[PDB]
Amino acid sequence: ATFEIVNRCSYTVWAAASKGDAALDAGGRQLNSGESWTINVEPGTNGGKIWARTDCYFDDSGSGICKTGDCGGLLRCKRFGRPPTTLAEFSLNQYGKDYIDISNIKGFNVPMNFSPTTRGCRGVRCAADIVGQCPAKLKAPGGGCNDACTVFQTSEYCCTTGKCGPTEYSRFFKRLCPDAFSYVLDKPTTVTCPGSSNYRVTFCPTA
């Protein structure tokens, strides 16, 4: 499957793509404002994620640090990134269907649209000013708005026992972005697409 990753933000981001134990395609790349990066993702890929990283510094060896979404200090991510990270999540070719969603379960750093470029389903978007409106206790100094599990590490926020309800903090993310997961047991906002669809992930879709 083909994913085109487009940075419409006015600032540089470092895109990342991983399935947790391996990179997807090159795993990461710098995207200046307006740049597009096309990657190929193997059919059948389960649990893939794409995200943006902000304020990164890398040396010639591709080692460094980012203020949001850092994946063990690598330009080319093999594993998932450090919150806060708005997440585009996908599982491909699962019994004939693709499943896509956007998640704020690991917080929010950059607004995002995640849409198919082929026919058969709708896209999803989280483009509200979540960083600007972020509750004081969830604000990340490096930038971004953390989720409550990352900040407080309780069974209720992290849904450790498999039973948890919405919280004041999850309702904040849900109020601003109804179409994104706001906590682990949120009513699913997953979209079902035809198997082997192609996609575009746009950072800062309105700006």
Short mmCIF file of all heavy atoms in Angstrom, two decimals, residues 11 40 59 75 81 85-86 119 123-124 166 168 180 185 201 203:
data_model
loop_
_atom_site.label_atom_id
_atom_site.label_comp_id
_atom_site.label_asym_id
_atom_site.label_seq_id
_atom_site.Cartn_x
_atom_site.Cartn_y
_atom_site.Cartn_z
N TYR A 11 6.13 24.96 9.74
CA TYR A 11 7.39 24.56 10.34
C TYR A 11 7.80 23.17 9.85
O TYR A 11 6.97 22.39 9.38
CB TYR A 11 7.29 24.59 11.87
CG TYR A 11 6.07 23.90 12.44
CD1 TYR A 11 6.08 22.54 12.73
CD2 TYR A 11 4.90 24.61 12.69
CE1 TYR A 11 4.96 21.91 13.24
CE2 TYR A 11 3.78 23.99 13.21
CZ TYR A 11 3.81 22.64 13.49
OH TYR A 11 2.69 22.03 14.00
N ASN A 40 6.10 2.99 0.97
CA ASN A 40 5.39 1.77 0.68
C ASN A 40 5.30 0.94 1.93
O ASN A 40 6.30 0.75 2.63
CB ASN A 40 6.09 0.98 -0.42
CG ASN A 40 5.97 1.64 -1.77
OD1 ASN A 40 4.89 1.65 -2.38
ND2 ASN A 40 7.06 2.22 -2.26
N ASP A 59 22.65 14.43 13.82
CA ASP A 59 23.99 14.56 13.25
C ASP A 59 24.04 13.79 11.94
O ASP A 59 23.01 13.32 11.45
CB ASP A 59 25.05 14.04 14.23
CG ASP A 59 24.93 12.56 14.51
OD1 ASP A 59 24.34 11.83 13.68
OD2 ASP A 59 25.45 12.11 15.55
N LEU A 75 16.83 9.13 13.60
CA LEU A 75 16.11 9.77 12.51
C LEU A 75 15.17 8.74 11.89
O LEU A 75 14.00 9.03 11.63
CB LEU A 75 17.08 10.30 11.45
CG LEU A 75 16.45 10.83 10.16
CD1 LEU A 75 15.55 12.02 10.44
CD2 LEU A 75 17.52 11.19 9.16
N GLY A 81 7.28 6.40 19.15
CA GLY A 81 7.85 7.61 19.70
C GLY A 81 7.31 8.01 21.06
O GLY A 81 6.24 7.57 21.49
N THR A 85 2.28 12.56 21.03
CA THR A 85 2.26 12.33 19.59
C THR A 85 0.84 12.06 19.10
O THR A 85 0.22 11.07 19.51
CB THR A 85 3.07 11.07 19.22
OG1 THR A 85 2.62 9.97 20.01
CG2 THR A 85 4.56 11.27 19.44
N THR A 86 0.32 12.91 18.22
CA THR A 86 -0.92 12.59 17.52
C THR A 86 -0.60 11.38 16.64
O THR A 86 0.42 11.39 15.96
CB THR A 86 -1.35 13.76 16.63
OG1 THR A 86 -1.16 15.00 17.32
CG2 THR A 86 -2.80 13.63 16.20
N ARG A 119 -10.98 4.96 -3.54
CA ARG A 119 -12.39 5.08 -3.19
C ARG A 119 -12.83 4.04 -2.18
O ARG A 119 -12.16 3.03 -1.98
CB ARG A 119 -13.27 4.99 -4.45
CG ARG A 119 -14.74 5.31 -4.19
CD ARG A 119 -15.57 5.15 -5.45
NE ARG A 119 -15.62 3.77 -5.91
CZ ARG A 119 -16.18 3.37 -7.05
NH1 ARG A 119 -16.73 4.26 -7.86
NH2 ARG A 119 -16.18 2.09 -7.38
N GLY A 123 -12.30 9.79 5.38
CA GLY A 123 -11.11 10.04 6.17
C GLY A 123 -11.48 10.55 7.55
O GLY A 123 -12.65 10.76 7.86
N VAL A 124 -10.47 10.74 8.39
CA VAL A 124 -10.69 11.31 9.71
C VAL A 124 -9.68 12.43 9.96
O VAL A 124 -8.62 12.47 9.33
CB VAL A 124 -10.56 10.25 10.81
CG1 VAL A 124 -11.83 9.38 10.84
CG2 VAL A 124 -9.33 9.40 10.57
N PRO A 166 -14.40 7.34 30.91
CA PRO A 166 -13.86 8.63 30.50
C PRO A 166 -13.52 9.48 31.73
O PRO A 166 -14.05 9.24 32.82
CB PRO A 166 -15.01 9.26 29.70
CG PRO A 166 -16.24 8.58 30.19
CD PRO A 166 -15.85 7.21 30.66
N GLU A 168 -12.00 13.69 33.12
CA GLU A 168 -12.02 15.10 32.77
C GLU A 168 -11.01 15.34 31.66
O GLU A 168 -11.27 16.09 30.72
CB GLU A 168 -11.69 15.97 33.99
CG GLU A 168 -12.90 16.29 34.87
CD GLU A 168 -14.10 16.80 34.08
OE1 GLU A 168 -14.14 18.01 33.76
OE2 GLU A 168 -15.00 15.98 33.75
N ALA A 180 -11.30 11.25 17.02
CA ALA A 180 -10.07 10.58 17.45
C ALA A 180 -10.30 9.86 18.77
O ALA A 180 -11.08 10.33 19.59
CB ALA A 180 -8.96 11.60 17.63
N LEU A 185 -10.70 2.85 26.15
CA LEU A 185 -12.01 2.23 25.90
C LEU A 185 -13.04 3.16 25.27
O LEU A 185 -14.25 2.96 25.41
CB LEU A 185 -12.57 1.63 27.19
CG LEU A 185 -11.85 0.41 27.75
CD1 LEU A 185 -12.52 -0.05 29.05
CD2 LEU A 185 -11.83 -0.72 26.73
N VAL A 201 -1.52 11.10 4.61
CA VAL A 201 -1.49 11.70 5.94
C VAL A 201 -0.98 13.11 5.77
O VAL A 201 0.13 13.31 5.27
CB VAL A 201 -0.54 10.93 6.86
CG1 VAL A 201 -0.41 11.65 8.19
CG2 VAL A 201 -1.05 9.50 7.08
N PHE A 203 -0.09 16.67 7.70
CA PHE A 203 0.10 17.43 8.93
C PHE A 203 -0.34 18.86 8.70
O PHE A 203 -0.10 19.42 7.63
CB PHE A 203 1.57 17.39 9.35
CG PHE A 203 2.12 16.00 9.52
CD1 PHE A 203 3.21 15.59 8.78
CD2 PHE A 203 1.57 15.13 10.45
CE1 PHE A 203 3.74 14.31 8.95
CE2 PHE A 203 2.09 13.85 10.61
CZ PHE A 203 3.18 13.45 9.86
#
